[PDB]
Protein backbone atom coordinates (compact mmCIF):
# COMPACT_ATOMS: atom_id res chain seq x y z
CA UNK A 1 0.00 0.00 0.00
CA UNK A 2 1.52 3.36 -1.11
CA UNK A 3 1.76 6.49 1.12
CA UNK A 4 -1.30 8.77 1.00
CA UNK A 5 -0.55 11.95 -1.09
CA UNK A 6 -0.55 14.07 2.14
CA UNK A 7 2.42 11.88 3.47
CA UNK A 8 4.34 11.83 0.09
CA UNK A 9 4.23 15.69 0.34
CA UNK A 10 5.75 15.75 3.91
CA UNK A 11 8.67 13.69 2.41
CA UNK A 12 9.10 16.02 -0.65
CA UNK A 13 9.14 19.06 1.71
CA UNK A 14 11.99 17.50 3.81
CA UNK A 15 13.85 16.43 0.60
CA UNK A 16 13.51 19.98 -0.92
CA UNK A 17 14.35 21.70 2.51
CA UNK A 18 17.89 23.26 2.61
CA UNK A 19 17.42 23.86 6.42
CA UNK A 20 17.35 20.03 7.26
CA UNK A 21 20.70 18.06 7.31
CA UNK A 22 21.80 16.36 3.99
CA UNK A 23 21.60 12.96 5.88
CA UNK A 24 17.80 13.47 6.42
CA UNK A 25 17.51 14.94 2.87
CA UNK A 26 19.10 11.66 1.56
CA UNK A 27 16.89 9.41 3.78
CA UNK A 28 13.77 11.26 2.45
CA UNK A 29 15.04 10.83 -1.14
CA UNK A 30 15.31 7.04 -0.47
CA UNK A 31 11.75 6.85 1.04
CA UNK A 32 10.46 8.78 -1.96
CA UNK A 33 12.19 6.37 -4.41
CA UNK A 34 11.11 3.25 -2.38
CA UNK A 35 7.49 4.40 -1.95
CA UNK A 36 7.29 5.23 -5.71
CA UNK A 37 8.83 1.83 -6.64
CA UNK A 38 6.43 0.21 -4.18
CA UNK A 39 3.37 1.86 -5.90
CA UNK A 40 4.65 0.69 -9.37
CA UNK A 41 5.04 -2.93 -7.89
CA UNK A 42 1.43 -2.77 -6.52
CA UNK A 43 0.38 -1.52 -10.03
CA UNK A 44 2.02 -4.56 -11.73
CA UNK A 45 0.66 -6.92 -8.98
CA UNK A 46 -3.00 -5.75 -9.19
CA UNK A 47 -2.99 -5.56 -13.08
CA UNK A 48 -1.69 -9.24 -13.11
CA UNK A 49 -4.20 -10.30 -10.29
CA UNK A 50 -7.17 -8.61 -12.11
CA UNK A 51 -6.26 -10.47 -15.39
CA UNK A 52 -5.70 -13.68 -13.26
CA UNK A 53 -9.16 -13.43 -11.47
CA UNK A 54 -10.68 -12.78 -14.96
CA UNK A 55 -9.14 -15.96 -16.59
CA UNK A 56 -10.04 -17.85 -13.33
CA UNK A 57 -13.70 -16.60 -13.12
CA UNK A 58 -14.19 -17.42 -16.89
CA UNK A 59 -12.53 -20.89 -16.40
CA UNK A 60 -14.79 -21.72 -13.34
CA UNK A 61 -17.97 -20.67 -15.28
CA UNK A 62 -16.96 -22.87 -18.26
CA UNK A 63 -16.66 -25.71 -15.62
CA UNK A 64 -20.33 -25.07 -14.55
CA UNK A 65 -21.45 -24.73 -18.27
CA UNK A 66 -19.96 -28.22 -18.99
CA UNK A 67 -21.49 -29.57 -15.70
CA UNK A 68 -24.92 -28.23 -16.93
CA UNK A 69 -24.29 -29.77 -20.42
CA UNK A 70 -23.63 -33.09 -18.56
CA UNK A 71 -27.05 -32.66 -16.82
CA UNK A 72 -28.85 -31.83 -20.17
CA UNK A 73 -27.47 -35.08 -21.65
CA UNK A 74 -28.75 -37.07 -18.60
CA UNK A 75 -32.14 -35.22 -19.05
CA UNK A 76 -32.40 -36.23 -22.79
CA UNK A 77 -31.43 -39.79 -21.69
CA UNK A 78 -34.43 -39.86 -19.18
CA UNK A 79 -36.64 -38.84 -22.21
CA UNK A 80 -35.33 -41.88 -24.23
CA UNK A 81 -35.95 -44.04 -21.09
CA UNK A 82 -39.45 -42.48 -20.63
CA UNK A 83 -40.38 -42.82 -24.35
CA UNK A 84 -39.28 -46.55 -24.40
CA UNK A 85 -41.62 -47.37 -21.42
CA UNK A 86 -44.47 -45.23 -22.87
CA UNK A 87 -44.44 -46.99 -26.30
CA UNK A 88 -44.77 -50.36 -24.37
CA UNK A 89 -47.43 -49.15 -21.83
CA UNK A 90 -49.53 -47.87 -24.81
CA UNK A 91 -49.03 -51.21 -26.65
CA UNK A 92 -50.31 -52.96 -23.45
CA UNK A 93 -53.40 -50.60 -23.26
CA UNK A 94 -54.27 -51.62 -26.91
CA UNK A 95 -53.61 -55.33 -25.94
CA UNK A 96 -55.64 -55.44 -22.61
CA UNK A 97 -58.60 -53.83 -24.54
CA UNK A 98 -58.42 -56.53 -27.31
CA UNK A 99 -58.39 -59.33 -24.63
CA UNK A 100 -61.33 -57.56 -22.78
CA UNK A 101 -63.41 -57.45 -26.09
CA UNK A 102 -62.41 -61.02 -27.24
CA UNK A 103 -63.15 -62.48 -23.69
CA UNK A 104 -66.22 -60.23 -22.72
CA UNK B 1 -0.32 3.83 -16.09
CA UNK B 2 2.53 5.26 -13.92
CA UNK B 3 6.01 6.23 -15.26
CA UNK B 4 8.56 3.38 -15.26
CA UNK B 5 11.10 3.84 -12.37
CA UNK B 6 13.85 4.73 -14.93
CA UNK B 7 11.66 7.77 -16.07
CA UNK B 8 10.67 8.84 -12.47
CA UNK B 9 14.47 9.05 -11.83
CA UNK B 10 15.12 11.37 -14.87
CA UNK B 11 12.45 13.71 -13.31
CA UNK B 12 14.01 13.57 -9.77
CA UNK B 13 17.45 14.36 -11.29
CA UNK B 14 16.05 17.51 -13.04
CA UNK B 15 14.11 18.49 -9.85
CA UNK B 16 17.26 18.04 -7.65
CA UNK B 17 19.57 19.77 -10.31
CA UNK B 18 20.68 23.33 -9.29
CA UNK B 19 22.14 23.82 -12.86
CA UNK B 20 18.61 23.69 -14.57
CA UNK B 21 16.32 26.82 -14.37
CA UNK B 22 13.83 27.00 -11.38
CA UNK B 23 10.96 27.02 -14.01
CA UNK B 24 12.02 23.49 -15.22
CA UNK B 25 12.72 22.48 -11.57
CA UNK B 26 9.07 23.49 -10.76
CA UNK B 27 7.62 21.72 -13.86
CA UNK B 28 9.50 18.51 -12.83
CA UNK B 29 8.16 18.87 -9.25
CA UNK B 30 4.60 19.04 -10.72
CA UNK B 31 5.16 15.92 -12.97
CA UNK B 32 6.55 14.09 -9.93
CA UNK B 33 3.48 15.03 -7.81
CA UNK B 34 1.02 14.26 -10.69
CA UNK B 35 2.65 10.93 -11.61
CA UNK B 36 2.67 9.90 -7.90
CA UNK B 37 -1.01 10.95 -7.48
CA UNK B 38 -1.76 9.09 -10.71
CA UNK B 39 -0.17 5.83 -9.34
CA UNK B 40 -2.20 6.18 -6.05
CA UNK B 41 -5.44 6.67 -8.21
CA UNK B 42 -4.57 3.50 -10.25
CA UNK B 43 -3.98 1.74 -6.85
CA UNK B 44 -7.48 2.73 -5.60
CA UNK B 45 -9.02 1.90 -9.06
CA UNK B 46 -7.50 -1.62 -9.36
CA UNK B 47 -8.15 -2.51 -5.63
CA UNK B 48 -11.88 -1.50 -6.19
CA UNK B 49 -12.00 -3.35 -9.65
CA UNK B 50 -10.40 -6.54 -8.15
CA UNK B 51 -13.01 -6.55 -5.29
CA UNK B 52 -15.74 -5.73 -7.94
CA UNK B 53 -14.71 -8.64 -10.31
CA UNK B 54 -14.64 -10.89 -7.18
CA UNK B 55 -18.26 -10.00 -6.06
CA UNK B 56 -19.29 -10.22 -9.78
CA UNK B 57 -17.60 -13.64 -10.46
CA UNK B 58 -19.14 -15.05 -7.19
CA UNK B 59 -22.60 -13.56 -8.11
CA UNK B 60 -22.48 -15.09 -11.69
CA UNK B 61 -21.49 -18.56 -10.28
CA UNK B 62 -24.39 -18.42 -7.76
CA UNK B 63 -26.61 -17.71 -10.87
CA UNK B 64 -25.33 -20.97 -12.52
CA UNK B 65 -25.66 -22.91 -9.15
CA UNK B 66 -29.38 -21.87 -8.96
CA UNK B 67 -29.80 -22.66 -12.72
CA UNK B 68 -28.36 -26.19 -11.98
CA UNK B 69 -30.67 -26.50 -8.90
CA UNK B 70 -33.58 -25.65 -11.30
CA UNK B 71 -32.38 -28.53 -13.58
CA UNK B 72 -32.08 -31.00 -10.59
CA UNK B 73 -35.71 -30.23 -9.65
CA UNK B 74 -36.83 -30.89 -13.28
CA UNK B 75 -34.74 -34.16 -13.14
CA UNK B 76 -36.48 -35.36 -9.89
CA UNK B 77 -39.82 -34.39 -11.56
CA UNK B 78 -38.99 -36.72 -14.60
CA UNK B 79 -38.39 -39.50 -11.96
CA UNK B 80 -41.92 -38.91 -10.48
CA UNK B 81 -43.28 -38.91 -14.10
CA UNK B 82 -41.25 -42.10 -14.91
CA UNK B 83 -42.27 -43.90 -11.66
CA UNK B 84 -46.03 -43.09 -12.26
CA UNK B 85 -45.90 -44.71 -15.77
CA UNK B 86 -43.80 -47.67 -14.51
CA UNK B 87 -46.25 -48.57 -11.65
CA UNK B 88 -49.06 -48.66 -14.35
CA UNK B 89 -47.03 -50.56 -17.04
CA UNK B 90 -46.18 -53.21 -14.36
CA UNK B 91 -49.87 -53.38 -13.29
CA UNK B 92 -50.73 -53.99 -17.01
CA UNK B 93 -48.04 -56.78 -17.30
CA UNK B 94 -49.70 -58.55 -14.26
CA UNK B 95 -53.18 -57.93 -15.91
CA UNK B 96 -52.33 -59.12 -19.53
CA UNK B 97 -50.83 -62.35 -17.95
CA UNK B 98 -54.06 -62.99 -15.92
CA UNK B 99 -56.21 -62.52 -19.11
CA UNK B 100 -53.75 -64.82 -21.08
CA UNK B 101 -54.10 -67.61 -18.36
CA UNK B 102 -57.93 -67.15 -17.89
CA UNK B 103 -58.51 -67.14 -21.76
CA UNK B 104 -55.75 -69.73 -22.81
CL1 LIG C 1 -39.18 -39.86 -31.53
CL1 LIG D 1 -41.07 -44.22 -3.90
NI1 LIG E 1 8.55 4.80 3.63
NI1 LIG F 1 7.17 9.59 -5.28
NI1 LIG G 1 4.10 13.29 -16.58
NI1 LIG H 1 7.01 10.18 -7.30
Author numbering:
A (entry chain A), B (entry chain A): 278 to 381
Question: How did the manuscript describe this experimental structure?
Answer:
In line with this, the primary structure of lamins reveals a central α-helical domain responsible for the CC formation which is flanked by non-helical N- and C-terminal domains called the head and the tail respectively.
In addition, a construct comprising residues 1–49 of the Gp7 protein (N-terminal cap) fused by LA residues 327–403 was prepared. The last chimera additionally included a F40C point mutation, located at heptad repeat position ‘d’ within the Gp7 cap. Crystallographic data reveal good electron density for the capping motif and the lamin part up to residue 381, i.e., exactly the predicted end of the rod domain. The tail domain part (residues 382–403) is disordered in the crystals. As a result, the CC geometry of Gp7F40C-LA 327-403 reveals an unwinding that is in line with theoretical expectations for a stutter.
